[PDB]
């Protein structure tokens, strides 16, 4: 029974919703539960990073988001085999791996390759038994100053290049951008139909010439 003027609306309460209402009164108890669990995990893996492994440079999928770079799932096998880290040794020394990632580009692969080689220059790997080091172990001086780092290991930020104040060329001042966009729109929409009309013109051409 609506009155004079006001938005007509459809509240989704026609079901019996009072038997199922999730109330958030354990929000701070759940946060202190999670951070006590996080402190226990971070002190039970004692020199290792609390954030877990390292996760690669990854560009977001869709048109809204492809200019932003975020942390991905794991390093792909192709940048692992370029960085020389073995498939089953990467996650055991702390490098996350998913095999499902492709690498369709080259420069993102080389960014992940340089990021892995930076990680291997940065990590301090302890000998397995302390009384007997091996060839792939760090030196006992930097073993003394090893410690955890908080937050995500080598944080991933989308740094932007900065291009200086150019003096403008007259080719750029005679570039007609709106006509170029609409002309490319029209060519892309009409690519196929012009091709089949060229095909029909070719077949009537060979009919008129043969």
């Amino acid at each position: 029974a609506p009155s004079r003027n006001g938005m007509i609306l459809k509240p989704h309460f026609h079901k019996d919703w009072q038997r199922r209402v999730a109330t958030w009164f354990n929000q701070p108890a759940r946060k202190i539960r999670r951070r006590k669990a996080r402190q226990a995990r971070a002190r039970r893996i004692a020199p290792r990073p609390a954030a877990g492994p390292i996760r690669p440079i990854v560009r977001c999928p869709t048109v809204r988001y492809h200019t932003k770079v975020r942390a991905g799932r794991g390093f792909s096998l192709e940048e692992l085999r370029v960085a020389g880290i073995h498939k089953k040794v990467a996650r055991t020394i702390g490098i996350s791996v998913d095999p499902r990632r492709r690498n369709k580009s080259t420069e993102s692969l080389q960014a992940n390759v340089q990021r892995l080689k930076e990680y291997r220059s940065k990590l301090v790997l302890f000998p397995r038994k302390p009384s007997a080091p091996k060839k792939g172990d760090s030196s006992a001086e930097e073993l003394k100053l090893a410690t955890q780092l908080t937050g995500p290991v080598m944080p991933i930020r989308n740094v932007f290049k900065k291009e200086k104040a150019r003096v403008i060329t007259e080719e750029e001042k005679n570039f007609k951008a709106f006509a170029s966009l609409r002309m490319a729109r029209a060519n892309a929409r009409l690519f196929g139909i012009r091709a089949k009309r060229a095909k029909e013109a070719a077949e009537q051409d060979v009919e008129k010439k043969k």
Partner: protein
Amino acid sequence: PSRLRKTRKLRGHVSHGHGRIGKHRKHPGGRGNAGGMHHHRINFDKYHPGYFGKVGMRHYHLKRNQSFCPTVNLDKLWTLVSEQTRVNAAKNKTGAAPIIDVVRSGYYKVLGKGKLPKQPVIVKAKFFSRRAEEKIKGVGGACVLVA
């Protein structure tokens, strides 16, 4: 607060603010906004014209990411880049022009709403409107594309 509300001053009034001829019955006009076509016709036509019926094509799987192209204007095109570039490109007698990369600021399409100050630029967008391009050319300065 219930201390400030109405029902603290409707005690002792034998109908509690809902009349005595027409009592406060439960649901007299149907539940919700029922009776659109039938008996609330003139509310829905004096106050929500357009409400009944279909118009336009059905699009089964819409993705706002595909339809994403947010706009900026030539008024606020200089807002994106700090004041030091403006005052340096005003003091700068060499004709060098700053680059305004609108995409990293987060706007894909430059539309041209208002007056742009007479100061050269390289506006670097993903789309352009015709009037925005003509105003940047009329200031003297170029419109480059990035995808």
